[PDB]
Design a protein around this ligand. Structure first.
Ligand SMILES: CN(Cc1cnc2nc(N)nc(N)c2n1)c1ccc(C(=O)N[C@@H](CCC(=O)O)C(=O)O)cc1
Length: 162
């Protein structure tokens, strides 16, 4: 279990399913935090991708529908199902990308929280759920600037105390 999402100083994490801004640098970190491991995306995030299914790593789609289809991607509709699939692979980890509906499902199972805090402000309707940052600690933090000042991003890594 590993949370992973990108937000700005306002807390927004997307807009109409697709992102409002464009941070190509963050896309390079997503490919490294997915290839080799198991990717977990919902239905709104699955269609948000341009090329589907996503190669280089396993695809795990979770929705409340029982009539979906995808040649190459895995279609599941049970929390225990996604857990049994992750337990079967000891050399893989469960990465939660989104959307917010999927994050609510894996709320009682998360120790590492990866998030990218930006600097420029943006407008949108998609926001991040209310999490508790008092029972966590930051051990890793790398600031990365981009060509513009509004496209600045900082990779933060929070972890549970015990
Ligand atoms: C909309 N979306 C979801 C998305 C976008 N930004 C994020 N940013 C962070 N920090 N974390 C996430 N989970 C995240 N998820 C996307 C958009 C593009 C690709 C994508 O093309 N990924 C390629 C990147 C390859 C390339 O750069 O060409 C990969 O192989 O993973 C994936 C998810």
């Amino acid at each position: 279990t590993a949370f992973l999402w990108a937000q700005d100083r306002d807390g927004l994490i997307g807009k109409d399913g697709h992102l409002p801004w464009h941070l190509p640098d963050d896309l390079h970190y997503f490919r490294a935090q997915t290839v080799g491991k198991i990717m977990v995306v919902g239905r709104r995030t699955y269609e948000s991708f341009p090329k589907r299914p996503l190669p280089e790593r396993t695809n795990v789609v979770l929705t409340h529908q029982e009539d979906y289809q995808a040649q190459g991607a895995v279609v599941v509709h049970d929390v225990a199902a996604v857990f049994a699939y992750a337990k079967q692979h000891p050399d893989q980890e469960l990465v939660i990308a989104g959307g917010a509906q999927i994050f609510t499902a894996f709320k009682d199972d998360v120790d590492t929280l990866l998030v990218t805090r930006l600097a420029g402000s943006f407008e949108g309707d998609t926001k991040m759920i209310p999490l508790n940052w008092d029972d966590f600690t930051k051990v890793s933090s790398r600031t990365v600037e981009d060509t513009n000042p509004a496209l600045t991003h900082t990779y933060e890594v929070w972890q549970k105390k015990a």
